[PDB]
A paper describes a structure:
The S. cerevisiae plasma membrane H+-ATPase, Pma1, is a P3A-type ATPase and the primary protein component of the membrane compartment of Pma1 (MCP). Like other plasma membrane H+-ATPases, Pma1 assembles and functions as a hexamer, a property unique to this subfamily among the larger family of P-type ATPases. Like all other P-type ATPases, the plasma membrane H+-ATPase has a transmembrane domain (TMD) composed of ten transmembrane α-helices (TMs), an actuator domain (A-domain), a nucleotide-binding domain (N-domain), and a phosphorylation domain (P-domain). Remarkably, we found that the Pma1 hexamer encircles a liquid-crystalline membrane domain composed of 57 ordered lipid molecules.
We determined the cryo-EM structure of autoinhibited Pma1 hexamer at pH 7.4 to 3.2 Å resolution without imposing any symmetry; we term this structure Pma1-pH7-C1. We found that the TMD and P-domains are well ordered and symmetric, while the A-and N-domains are asymmetric and flexible. At pH 7.4, the carboxyl-terminal regulatory α-helix binds to the phosphorylation domains of two neighboring Pma1 subunits, locking the hexamer in the autoinhibited state. The C-terminal peptide (880–918, termed C-tail) forms two α-helices in the autoinhibited structure of Pma1. The first C-tail helix is short, horizontal, and partially embedded in the membrane. The second C-tail helix is longer and mediates the interaction between the P-domain and the P-domain of the neighboring subunit. In the autoinhibited state, S911, H914, and E917 of helix-i interact with K566, N577, Y579, and R583 of the P-domain to the left, and R898, E901, and D902 of helix-i interact with S595', D599', and R625' of the neighboring P-domain to the right. Major interactions include two inter-molecular salt bridges (R898:D599' and E901:R625') and an intramolecular hydrogen bond (S911:K566). We have shown that autoinhibition of Pma1 is achieved primarily by the C-tail helix-i simultaneously binding and constraining the movement of two neighboring P-domains. In the autoinhibited state, D730 is surrounded by R695, N154, and Q125 but these residues are outside the range of direct interaction.
Numbering used by the authors:
A (entry chain A): 291 to 339
B (entry chain B): 110 to 174, 178 to 263, 266 to 918
C (entry chain C): 871 to 918
Write the structure that this text describes.
Amino acid sequence: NGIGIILLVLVIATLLLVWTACFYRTNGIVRILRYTLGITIIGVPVGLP
Amino acid sequence: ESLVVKFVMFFVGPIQFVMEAAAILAAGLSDWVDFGVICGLLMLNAGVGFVQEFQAGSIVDELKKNTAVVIRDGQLVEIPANEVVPGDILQLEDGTVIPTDGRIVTEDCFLQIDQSAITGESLAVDKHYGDQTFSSSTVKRGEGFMVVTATNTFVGRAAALVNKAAGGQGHFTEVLNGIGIILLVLVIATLLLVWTACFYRTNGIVRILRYTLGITIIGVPVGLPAVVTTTMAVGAAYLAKKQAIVQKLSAIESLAGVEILCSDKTGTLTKNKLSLHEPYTVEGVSPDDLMLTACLAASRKKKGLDAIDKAFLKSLKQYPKAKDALTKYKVLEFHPFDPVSKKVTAVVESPEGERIVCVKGAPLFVLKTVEEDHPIPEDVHENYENKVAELASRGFRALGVARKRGEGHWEILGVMPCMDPPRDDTAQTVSEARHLGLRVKMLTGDAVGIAKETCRQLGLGTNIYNAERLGLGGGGDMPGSELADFVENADGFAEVFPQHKYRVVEILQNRGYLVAMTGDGVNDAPSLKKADTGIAVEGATDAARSAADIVFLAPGLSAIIDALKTSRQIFHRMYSYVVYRIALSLHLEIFLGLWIAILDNSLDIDLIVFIAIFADVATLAIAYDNAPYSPKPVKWNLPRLWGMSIILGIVLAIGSWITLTTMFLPKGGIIQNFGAMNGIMFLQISLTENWLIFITRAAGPFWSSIPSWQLAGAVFAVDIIATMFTLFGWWSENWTDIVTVVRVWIWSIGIFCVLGGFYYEMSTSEAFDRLMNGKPMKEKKSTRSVEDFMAAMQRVSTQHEKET
Amino acid sequence: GFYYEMSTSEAFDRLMNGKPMKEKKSTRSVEDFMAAMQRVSTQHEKET
Ligand SMILES: CCCCCCCC/C=C\CCCCCCCC(=O)O[C@@H](COC(=O)CCCCCCCCCCCCCCC)COP(=O)([O-])OCC[N+](C)(C)C
Ligand SMILES: CCCCCCCC/C=C\CCCCCCCC(=O)O[C@@H](COC(=O)CCCCCCCCCCCCCCC)COP(=O)([O-])OCC[N+](C)(C)C
Ligand SMILES: CCCCCCCC/C=C\CCCCCCCC(=O)O[C@@H](COC(=O)CCCCCCCCCCCCCCC)COP(=O)([O-])OCC[N+](C)(C)C
Ligand SMILES: CCCCCCCC/C=C\CCCCCCCC(=O)O[C@@H](COC(=O)CCCCCCCCCCCCCCC)COP(=O)([O-])OCC[N+](C)(C)C
């Protein structure tokens, strides 16, 4: 529960980076959501617990 | 009258006077845009205060939520509760509802009441002669007469405290004067920024004044002194539910932050009634049959009902608890108590024509009946005196039983111990008070050996001292720095006196602690005044109750701890809201202040009103939310409250500056199809701000405590209202499409997680607490010096046991 | 604002005079001394 929060913190921290940088380059929400799908797959390992 | 109380808040109050004087000036100049702004605020400001006092009044009237049986000219007659006059005697039966606070005359069979008038909790307390009963209680067992003390009763005194508190007073009112200046400082600091930057861009005074109207609406929250003061006033009515009547509202804040609770043993930690232990009896032939013999040796009628004896009559485990000691024994003669001899004996007749004799008396005087009846005459002297000695090592007062077959020969059946036992919840309570971050010290009049046993029973820690020998009386060879270390780390102080209780508080407070001293007597009052929260436990005299800061009606440490857990809930409700509503002021002074300075624009004056309206809607439900309390004590750490709020405002203003700066781009940035610069920024501000009440409300991280349906319903209702403004472009230039709105929603969820991250790793770190107060770690003992000292207490507190 | 948070702060008073906090007793040494007065002033009572 302590590790799983900090990886969730690190997913949100980069999702803030890839949403901000996809808002400035005005990207469709579909293109942004394919980016956050890719970062969530790598970002949260559900295999640890 | 509800329509009367509305227009009072409009007129009365100089802040309202300045606005409604400005509402006239704008209206007299036909400045209708700024007219609906200022009059929108008064409908807000007087509107929020009404729903706040309507919430407070509802809980008070429910706290104020009949018949009484009296005697008139000696005639039993039944009257409604409204006819009872204080200075009167009432009649009380089983199942009765107490109409007024009243002191019992005397009881043939003692009485129990439920102190759960609103809670409905199952447990009850015993009530004896001279004991104080309280209104809206219900009798579960017993009967007797009660002399009513008043109708202003304590609940009526508590309700009168709350209604007066609607004005506003206390130490937290001194804090609000400290907070309210710094927010006024922060308004002027940005008004200097948005006037300077509007002078250089030569702007008309009307355009500048629409900017300062917008920054004042966001900048000064007039809702804090209404919400903070009502939170205590509701909290004082929530505490009187928990049988704790605070003498001032600041007792809620002081009890919240108390770090050491010096709890007197005799009332709180122990039942204050004598009872017996069967596994701690002698190796007499029946441990189980031994108690039956002693119940024979006591008369069963009130003429011989000694309090020691009456304890024995009701220790029986058999279903005939009272009958089994009179079953077929056929008493022929009984010898009463004679103080020179210290013996009571009963002689009963057997069914098979035998005159058996049983006695009860002091173990020295039991042992002298026949000095050589028992075998091993010298060891049986030693073993009983040794096991009497270990009873004194356990502090148990000892009484013996002996028996005759009938001829005259004595048979020493044994000795049974009767002791004031710890209350059954107190072992769990001391465990729970240790989890609540505060330390319990037990101050007792008993000896050091006696109270070391009670420390063992509760799990307190068994490191106690003679109060006189250790110091605490102005004597001793111990240095004042070492006496303070002993008192700070003592687990209790035995043989303590009211002159010492003052010194324990005074020594601990020089160390910087907030000390809760429980006081019962009239002599405990100078310590209760000195103590940072002085507690008058149940059964306190008028001098303790008048000198206490918080007055209890439920005996026990668990009532003190549950009023401590509640007072941490009440505080964290007023603290989560202050951290929040300051951060929204900083969010929008930093954002709209730099929007004017850098870009000479702001959110529309129409939209800025709705953001301040939306922030106040969280006040309506912050009263109703389930309350998480922090474990460790809470203290209005104003350098930390201002560090957390300024960082949460800087983080929020960074997040809003990112959305705004995306929209400066051609192709729109956060705007996917079509959108407004204001409609999006109003939505983004309304979302990230109102979700901040989810962050600050939690004692730990925001995911720990799920919010109530009232708070999450009020925040989501705003987030629906704030969205529908954006989609349909109300008070904004254009419509904003549903796809841009869901971009702002997902971005504002991301910032809520960033804020929840910052506020958690900032609220819980002592590194941030250290930095904000600027207070270094000055007095940390060596790790080796603590080990040397820890054993020094264990040696000294062993010495204090052996002085006898 | 400036004159209030400057007139009342001892940090500004310290800086302007250039006088550091040279003689601050230990917090433990004050406790030792405070009780030393209370013992001695008890002794001075008992001399009669
Ligand atoms: C750690 C502390 C750091 C502080 C943050 C530093 C952030 C600042 C960093 C960078 C901001 C600079 C942005 C560059 C803009 C370039 C383009 C531009 O428009 O320039 C503009 C001028 O530009 C200015 O005047 C900037 C002045 C703002 C200084 C504020 C510092 C106060 C710090 C106190 C902190 C505040 C807290 C408030 C108190 C609670 C052009 O002038 P204009 O004609 O007016 O623009 C268009 C007008 N029109 C659209 C109507 C036509
Ligand atoms: C501590 C925080 C430090 C913050 C640093 C701030 C650095 C930022 C400074 C400057 C940012 C860039 C300014 C020039 C931008 C280009 C100029 C231009 O194109 O036209 C502009 C020329 O008008 C001017 O001359 C602008 C002058 C602004 C200087 C303000 C100093 C702020 C000092 C703060 C001291 C804080 C003291 C607090 C300390 C206690 C006019 O604009 P326009 O033609 O009407 O239309 C918009 C033009 N645009 C869209 C192309 C933009
Ligand atoms: C931490 C920092 C985060 C934010 C960094 C942001 C950097 C990115 C900066 C700019 C991104 C690119 C914008 C311009 C690019 C396109 C050119 C252009 O359109 O001109 C623009 C000029 O307006 C500006 O120059 C914007 C100036 C941004 C100032 C940000 C202040 C940061 C202070 C944060 C302190 C917070 C912490 C407070 C602590 C105390 C258009 O201006 P407009 O009139 O408005 O629009 C016209 C309409 N149109 C453009 C669609 C046609
Ligand atoms: C940790 C903090 C991180 C900070 C990150 C820094 C982020 C800075 C990153 C990028 C900033 C600049 C991005 C350039 C993109 C524009 C490209 C361009 O075409 O030129 C533009 C000019 O641009 C302007 O007119 C002014 C915009 C630049 C001012 C940005 C100041 C940022 C202040 C930061 C404050 C930080 C203070 C925070 C202190 C706490 C085009 O303008 P144009 O030629 O006139 O015509 C446009 C025609 N068109 C509309 C069809 C296109």
